[PDB]
Every structure is written in structure tokens, then in C-alpha cells.
Amino acid sequence: PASTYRLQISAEFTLFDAARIVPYLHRLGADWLYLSPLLESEPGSSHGYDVVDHSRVDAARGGPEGLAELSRAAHERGMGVVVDIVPNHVGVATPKANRWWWDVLARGQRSEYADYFDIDWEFGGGRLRLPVLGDGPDELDALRVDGDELVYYEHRFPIAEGTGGGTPREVHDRQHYELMSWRRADHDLNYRRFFAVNTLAAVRVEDPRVFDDTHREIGRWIAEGLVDGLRVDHPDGLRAPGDYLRRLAELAQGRPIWVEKIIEGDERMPPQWPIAGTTGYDALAGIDRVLVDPAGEHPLTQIVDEAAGSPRRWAELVPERKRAVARGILNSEIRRVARELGEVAGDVEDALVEIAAALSVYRSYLPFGREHLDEAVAAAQAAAPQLEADLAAVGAALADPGNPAALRFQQTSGMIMAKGVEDNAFYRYPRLTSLTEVGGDPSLFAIDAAAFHAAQRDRAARLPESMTTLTTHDTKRSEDTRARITALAEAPERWRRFLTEVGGLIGTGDRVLENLIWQAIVGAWPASRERLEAYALKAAREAGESTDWIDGDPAFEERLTRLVTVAVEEPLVHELLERLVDELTAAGYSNGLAAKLLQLLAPGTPDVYQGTERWDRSLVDPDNRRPVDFAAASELLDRLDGGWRPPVDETGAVKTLVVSRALRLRRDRPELFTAYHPVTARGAQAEHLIGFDRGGAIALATRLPLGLAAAGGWGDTVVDVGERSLRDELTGREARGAARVAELFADYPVALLVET
């Protein structure tokens, strides 16, 4: 496809709602609709990742009639449909809604659905441990019997037949499940789950019988022409992801499959995987880093280091926090891998924790990626020479794809990275929070244009059909929030001044977390107190230093709450914040347009998140999933198509112009996109021009806008565009030969030149 447009389908935006805005999306220039999980989820699911019935399209989202209508709307217009599917796990929040889970609770290992899940029965003493009770003592006195069901407040579980009668507790101890305290899920859990989410139980989709049942309706979409490609959720949690994608490719009849897979650096995926590529986060990392002024690296780091009283080094942070979740909320996983290894050596768990800590990829794919495991083991032996013998024997076992533990470890190192680095270490390394993003190396402050172009060339060579992306439903900060934040690398000293001035007014005791919060407030501004308060509490808990998700500090959280309230409502704090936002507003606009244009014409299939044809200043889940005003966007676009040329302003109109013109061009004139050639400028400010030629379409953008303005503008800087004559889709302005960037960017900080 020429592009994918991502839609959050739910009961508030159904498949019928989506089909009604298909014509606006075609107008905007989208090629394929990228929908979220559509199999029946938990009653009230606003994402659909908690599947409870793989046999039908979710009724709340429109059921099969809805899918059929959306597909027909898209296909009658030449458009395509790619659907997010969730192969690894199912929702168990409401058991009475997961017929498979219910039967396993009701009949234990005698359930026909028992080997659909990944259960250590012997660790549980023949029982499935459900971490549903509260931590207070005497919890089970709330256990009531209600017919053929055990009840614990609003939770209901089946009574195995022939086990009724007596105290509610006497019936509970006869059941194939054991209700336990939620805090016991850190260490004593005996079923495989997704991340540290107990309400997401993994299914053994490597079993052909399980694959057939979980993918039958998905297979119907393919067979009957409803769906044109698939996006696989979390393949890294699968036991045999290679085998899965092979089987999915034949289910999808050779149609394009994209995988959500985080890549680290120059790491490569197994080439035999029959996929189009990833959902885009490798591309996000480079687009953002070409807009970071590299000279801010040491100033902005010292702002964090002085606050922490001790250098925050990413090389310590990552191992430390991976170690911590391996020993904490993800310990049931570590302990289970240790049980399957047997008494290989002495301290097997500490050997595992050290290998997962040092592992520099999310997982191996053995025999592929053995290098990564080998280097982890060696690095663990240097960080912990006390276990040199143990690590060697444990690493030796972990290298044999015939050992079930080697395979389970690969299912676990996926989650130690995400929960330790993305959802923790990120929130402790805020020297520039736009670089703490899904798929990025925050240690890598910036990349020069030469490095940017190399990254584009590599994707054209090995991943030409792969997605690129700037916002997803899982990003920590949405694309224009990061665009403004990134300008702080140009003005580190201004930022120090701001933190100081506003921190002499209100604080929490965690000056490191306050750097992160003010960055999000500044980047998202203007934003409601409700949204900023929610973000602040979530960021503070993810960071885990001054409060936590398990055992919070209410006094601290209320200091954080009154920080954001003072930022919105108090006259002097608010003025200081408004003044800094104004100073950055043009820079962030220019950075946001630069990112959007570069991504949409770069090699690959650009993904456009719902509503990001206007400014998206959202924060983390769920702020990046707010309702999207497609009506407003269409009205905006109709003004643009009616010949209005907007200023760079807060309506987003100039972004809608850039997005719509680049999407259409790529969709409707694809003969223009045949190669990739850097376009470099000439003169006093040539460093500020970043761009490339794709064939007959040239993307031209600005980097480091604050320093450009400080230097007096483009001056007499020129771009060589060829002996050819080009025209800018955004303005109609013509350019030939050595064009002055002052003329090219006379109206906007970007231009999209087309051969004539």
C-alpha cells in the first residue's frame, strides 16, 4: 500500500462509524485502513486486545455486518483493509465471558480447552492460581455461594460438579482453581500471561488445534475478500514465532503481514519470516533524532545528573531496572524458567536474571540470534563474576532450542525488556523525553543527516514494504508533543532557566521527575488539568521512584497533583509556562511538519494514526486514544481543497495540507517514487535543510529551527534541484536550478516539490 491509516475501533467508533468516514479518508489520501483488533473482546473493551471469543467479529464494534460494510466501503474505492490480530493471549478479566477459560476453571486438566493455555499445574499443586483477592487478611469470608458459582464481590467462578455443599471456603478448596492475593502474582503465578497483566492469559497458538480455533474467523476474512493484510500483535511472546508467521502466511494466502516487533539498533529480524516488516518504530527513532540539536546532549544530561545527585547513565539504568522486574513483578516467569532448567547449576534464578538484564535484544529466535544470547552470557559473567560457572551452564542450556526452558526464556526476555525499560527506565532518564519512545535508544541523542539518509537507504534495501510511524496507540508521547519537546535540545540553557524559575514556585521533592513532567506539560500545551494530572500520576508510578503502582505514596501524588494544578491555574506559574510555550511554538510546528513530511515520503509504507493530519499533542495511553473529530478534519480539508492557504497556526490546517498532499501524491502518482537520493543544500545555513529526492518528488524540511532563526534565517542558502523544473504542492511555487531556501520555505518550513 501507499499508506496505512490507523483507526481505533470500539463501541464509540464502530465499524459502521469507520465506514462512514471512509470517503473523508480517501479524500485525505489514505490508501489502506489499519483497524484494531475486531474479534469479540471483553464487554466494554476500548482496545480489543482482551479477546474472549475468536469465533466472531465483536458485536459492540458492529459484528460481521459491520466488518462487511467497512470492507465494502473501502474496496469500492480502491482502498485496502489491514486488521490487527492478537494471537498470543486472551482476556480473563470476566471469566463468565471466556468460554474456554470458564471450562478450564470448571473441569481443570480434564477440560478439552486445558492445553489451550500455558499452565504449570504441578507448581500450583494441581490448581490454577487466580490472583483476584485483595491483600487484607480474612478475604475469603466474602466468598459466597450463589447456585452453581463461587462469588467474590463482582467476580464469579464455576463450581466443579459434585463439589458443592459446606462452607463457601470448603467448596473453594475442592475447585481446580485457587483464588489467591493479587500480590502473590509477582512470584507464585502458574499460568503464562501477557506482560504483568494477570487478566491476559496466553494461549498455546503453536498447537495446530489452537491456531485453527483462534484463527478461523480471521481466516474467513481472508477467504471472503474482507481483509487485505494482517498486523500481528506481540509476536515476541510466541513460542515459535517463525512457525506462527509461516502458518499465518498461508492462512493469509500470501497477503502482506506486518509484525509489532521492537528492534534494537542495527539488529535484524529473521529473514525467513514471510512479513512486510514492522509497524514502524525503527523508522520513528531516526526521524526524531535527525531533528535533535546534538549540542544539547551534555547540557541536558547535566540538568538530570545535578538533580539526581549522581549521574543517570543509560548503561546502568537498563541492567538495573531489568534486574529489578525480573526479581519483582516478572518473577513468576523467571521462577518458571528455573523450574524447567532443573538444578543445572547453583543459583539458576540469579543466573537467569543476569542474562535477561544483559541481553541487548528483546529475544533470540534460536538458532537465529544466538550471538545475542552468547554476548549476554559473557556480559553477565563480567557484571557478576561470582556466578561465572553458573551463567556458563545456564547459558549453555538456554542456547538449545530443544530445551523447553530455552524457548520459554525467549518468551520472557520479551517482557523483561518492555516492563523494565519502556515502562520504567524511560521514566528515569528524562534528559530529553522525546527520545524515550517505543523503539528508541535514549543513549543516542541525535543522528546527522548522513546517518538519517543511511537509515532510509537500509529500509529501502531490506524492508521496502515495512511500515514507518510517528504515533501509535502505544507511543509514550504523540508526534507533535515530541516535536515541541525536541526543541529543548536547541535551548538547553533556556530550559534550565525555566525549570529553575518555575521550580522556585512549586515542586514535589523529585526534581528529576519534574523535568519529565514539565517537558510533557510544555509539549502538550494547551492541555486540561484533568489530562495533565492523569499523565503525571501515571508517569510517576511508571518511574517507580517517588510512588508506585503497588504501594503508592499518596502524599507525594498529591504534591504532584498540586504541581499540575498550579501550572494550569496559578497566574505566575501559568504565565511562565505560556511564555516558554510561545517561544517554542514555531520551532515545534516546524519540527512537527518536518517529521510528518519526511516520514510520509520516506521509503516504506507510512502509517498515519487517527487524527494526526492535525496537531496531535497527546500523552501516554490512554491520552493518545481520545475521540477523533473527523468532522472537523473534513471541514478543514474542504477549505484547503477550496484554495485557502493557511498560516502556520494552532488549527493544524498547514499539517492537514502537508499530510493530504503527500498522501495523495504517493497514492495517485506512484511513478514519482522510484529511488532515494539525499538532497543537500549549499551555504551559510545548509546544515538546516534536511531532505531527499524519491524520483520526481522531493521532500524538503527544516531541522534545528531555533538556531536558524538565531542566525537570521536562511540567508543566501540554496538547494540544487536539478536541471529539471519542479513545483511545490503546498504553494504552487516553482523552483529550478539553485533555488534559495528563503524562497522555497517562504510560506512554510517544508516544501514538497514535484517534477513538471
Side-chain angles (χ1 to χ4, degrees):
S3 56
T4 56
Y5 195 97
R6 165 82 187 193
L7 294 177
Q8 295 289 101
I9 308 301
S10 89
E12 289 82 24
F13 187 73
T14 70
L15 292 159
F16 291 107
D17 297 333
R20 274 181 280 281
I21 60 110
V22 162
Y24 158 71
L25 292 180
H26 189 273
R27 241 141 51 212
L28 179 79
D31 198 14
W32 283 25
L33 308 188
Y34 171 19
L35 317 173
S36 51
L38 300 180
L39 290 180
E40 183 84 15
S41 36
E42 163 117 357
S45 186
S46 97
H47 55 75
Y49 291 100
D50 36 13
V51 186
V52 311
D53 179 6
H54 311 255
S55 76
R56 58 190 225 269
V57 172
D58 182 85
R61 283 159 174 80
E65 293 84 11
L67 178 54
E69 171 66 9
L70 180 122
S71 201
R72 190 214 41 85
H75 285 154
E76 267 161 19
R77 300 171 159 80
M79 304 179 70
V81 185
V82 47
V83 181
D84 199 335
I85 67 189
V86 194
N88 179 63
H89 49 262
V90 303
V92 288
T94 293
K96 195 73 128 53
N98 195 316
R99 162 187 80 95
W100 290 354
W101 191 248
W102 188 256
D103 204 62
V104 172
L105 304 200
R107 314 200 43 220
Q109 320 207 49
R110 295 243 208 119
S111 171
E112 69 160 281
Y113 297 115
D115 50 349
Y116 279 49
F117 308 95
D118 195 356
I119 303 170
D120 201 324
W121 289 97
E122 220 164 17
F123 183 58
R127 278 170 100 200
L128 179 67
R129 310 177 133 157
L130 303 201
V132 174
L133 312 174
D135 50 338
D138 290 354
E139 271 308 326
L140 316 96
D141 297 315
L143 243 193
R144 290 337 168 192
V145 171
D146 180 4
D148 47 337
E149 289 179 4
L150 274 155
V151 190
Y152 174 75
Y153 296 101
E154 299 265 306
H155 309 283
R156 311 188 141 265
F157 314 88
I159 301 263
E161 184 206 338
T163 63
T167 40
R169 201 165 324 210
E170 263 161 349
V171 182
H172 169 254
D173 319 302
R174 303 208 262 272
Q175 298 302 325
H176 301 77
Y177 53 86
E178 183 171 14
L179 319 181
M180 66 180 345
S181 148
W182 64 267
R183 308 174 156 262
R184 268 182 91 195
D186 294 356
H187 295 278
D188 303 309
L189 206 72
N190 66 328
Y191 65 101
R192 181 161 71 87
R193 59 191 167 170
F194 177 71
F195 277 3
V197 187
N198 309 316
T199 43
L200 293 186
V203 288
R204 291 188 344 103
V205 84
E206 64 270 22
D207 182 331
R209 181 171 70 251
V210 175
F211 182 95
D212 290 348
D213 272 335
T214 43
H215 289 69
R216 178 169 308 99
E217 167 72 358
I218 298 168
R220 179 188 67 92
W221 305 340
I222 301 276
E224 284 177 31
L226 297 184
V227 169
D228 305 292
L230 310 161
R231 174 266 194 206
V232 185
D233 182 74
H234 204 247
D236 276 346
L238 307 176
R239 189 166 239 253
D243 284 349
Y244 174 74
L245 299 159
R246 193 172 314 108
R247 227 175 273 141
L248 186 69
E250 55 142 341
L251 185 78
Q253 292 174 37
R255 282 173 211 184
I257 294 168
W258 294 268
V259 293
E260 170 197 50
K261 195 254 165 315
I262 309 304
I263 304 179
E264 289 289 328
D266 58 2
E267 170 192 23
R268 317 194 150 175
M269 298 173 291
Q272 69 268 30
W273 286 8
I275 65 162
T278 81
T279 51
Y281 297 115
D282 39 297
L284 196 160
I287 299 177
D288 270 12
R289 272 159 187 84
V290 81
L291 302 184
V292 177
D293 185 3
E297 180 176 8
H298 298 116
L300 287 193
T301 306
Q302 289 300 122
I303 300 197
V304 176
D305 289 3
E306 283 158 47
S310 168
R312 278 306 161 91
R313 294 200 200 104
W314 194 244
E316 286 152 28
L317 221 41
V318 176
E320 276 162 22
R321 298 281 91 216
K322 286 180 100 186
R323 252 169 243 143
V325 309
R327 299 166 162 165
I329 55 139
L330 288 187
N331 204 233
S332 316
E333 277 75 20
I334 282 299
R335 284 182 73 185
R336 174 160 198 196
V337 175
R339 291 196 291 285
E340 304 185 340
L341 278 172
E343 270 231 36
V344 155
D347 325 303
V348 159
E349 290 189 21
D350 307 349
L352 292 172
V353 177
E354 284 310 317
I355 311 202
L359 188 60
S360 281
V361 292
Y362 276 55
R363 65 172 275 169
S364 47
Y365 302 103
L366 282 168
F368 181 95
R370 207 202 150 120
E371 37 162 351
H372 298 312
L373 176 45
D374 281 353
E375 312 186 357
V377 170
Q381 291 171 326
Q386 51 257 38
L387 316 152
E388 166 156 56
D390 311 61
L391 286 163
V394 177
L398 288 187
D400 189 350
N403 290 178
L407 295 191
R408 186 172 297 278
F409 186 78
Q410 297 182 139
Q411 315 197 255
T412 306
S413 84
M415 322 161 208
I416 287 169
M417 188 83 92
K419 287 317 280 171
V421 188
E422 294 173 31
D423 297 2
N424 198 24
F426 274 1
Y427 292 84
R428 298 190 180 202
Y429 193 69
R431 68 180 174 170
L432 187 60
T433 59
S434 71
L435 297 188
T436 46
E437 198 42 82
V438 179
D441 179 10
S443 207
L444 180 73
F445 198 70
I447 66 167
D448 63 9
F452 176 90
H453 291 313
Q456 314 312 316
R457 283 222 165 82
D458 179 59
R459 184 161 46 255
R462 316 174 25 254
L463 285 159
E465 285 315 305
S466 168
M467 290 181 175
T468 65
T469 201
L470 296 175
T471 309
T472 72
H473 54 293
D474 292 318
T475 55
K476 308 300 188 174
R477 287 145 271 250
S478 283
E479 59 199 46
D480 292 301
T481 306
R482 305 194 317 274
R484 191 184 279 157
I485 284 168
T486 296
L488 297 175
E490 271 177 288
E493 64 299 296
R494 173 59 173 114
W495 185 240
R496 195 190 286 271
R497 199 187 116 210
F498 173 82
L499 285 182
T500 284
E501 270 166 38
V502 84
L505 271 300
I506 189 89
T508 63
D510 198 342
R511 312 262 83 174
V512 177
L513 176 67
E514 288 166 31
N515 195 351
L516 191 151
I517 297 290
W518 281 116
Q519 277 190 46
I521 304 170
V522 166
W525 196 256
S528 67
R529 194 208 39 73
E530 295 87 320
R531 290 177 56 234
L532 297 180
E533 177 167 330
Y535 179 73
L537 297 190
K538 180 172 184 159
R541 305 176 172 153
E542 293 279 79
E545 292 177 84
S546 287
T547 190
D548 214 335
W549 292 103
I550 56 191
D551 274 322
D553 195 329
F556 172 83
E557 279 172 14
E558 249 175 84
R559 288 196 296 278
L560 195 40
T561 286
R562 95 220 192 297
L563 186 146
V564 309
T565 293
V566 166
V568 174
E569 312 194 317
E570 203 288 317
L572 178 50
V573 180
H574 189 253
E575 183 219 337
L576 291 195
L577 167 77
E578 277 201 326
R579 205 280 177 298
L580 179 72
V581 172
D582 292 8
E583 292 180 44
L584 302 190
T585 280
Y589 285 161
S590 162
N591 286 346
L593 292 175
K596 201 59 167 202
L597 179 64
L598 287 173
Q599 185 245 337
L600 286 178
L601 296 215
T605 295
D607 185 31
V608 184
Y609 191 64
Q610 47 173 35
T612 60
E613 66 271 14
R614 318 174 82 198
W615 308 123
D616 188 337
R617 285 179 324 255
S618 296
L619 303 156
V620 80
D621 180 14
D623 200 49
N624 56 355
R625 302 168 189 206
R626 288 173 293 154
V628 173
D629 201 343
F630 286 100
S634 179
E635 251 314 297
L636 218 43
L637 185 63
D638 223 34
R639 296 187 54 199
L640 294 169
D641 288 340
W644 177 55
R645 279 292 162 283
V648 188
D649 76 15
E650 66 293 328
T651 69
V654 59
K655 210 208 194 174
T656 314
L657 182 67
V658 166
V659 168
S660 71
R661 267 53 184 172
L663 285 178
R664 300 168 168 176
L665 194 63
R666 196 156 186 179
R667 182 189 62 194
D668 307 331
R669 297 192 56 193
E671 73 272 355
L672 292 169
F673 300 78
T674 49
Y676 182 90
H677 301 116
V679 163
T680 73
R682 227 204 300 138
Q685 330 296 339
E687 197 227 352
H688 291 281
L689 182 99
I690 176 85
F692 51 76
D693 178 19
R694 291 305 304 284
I698 305 176
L700 292 188
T702 306
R703 56 182 293 272
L704 269 52
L706 281 181
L708 179 62
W714 287 100
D716 297 355
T717 316
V718 307
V719 193
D720 272 315
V721 291
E723 252 196 319
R724 42 169 177 200
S725 172
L726 304 111
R727 191 205 290 117
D728 180 16
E729 285 275 306
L730 310 184
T731 62
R733 172 179 298 108
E734 280 181 32
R736 333 171 220 262
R740 323 181 70 242
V741 190
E743 289 161 2
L744 285 185
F745 292 165
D747 299 319
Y748 303 123
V750 293
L752 169 45
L753 308 184
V754 182
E755 243 170 10
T756 55

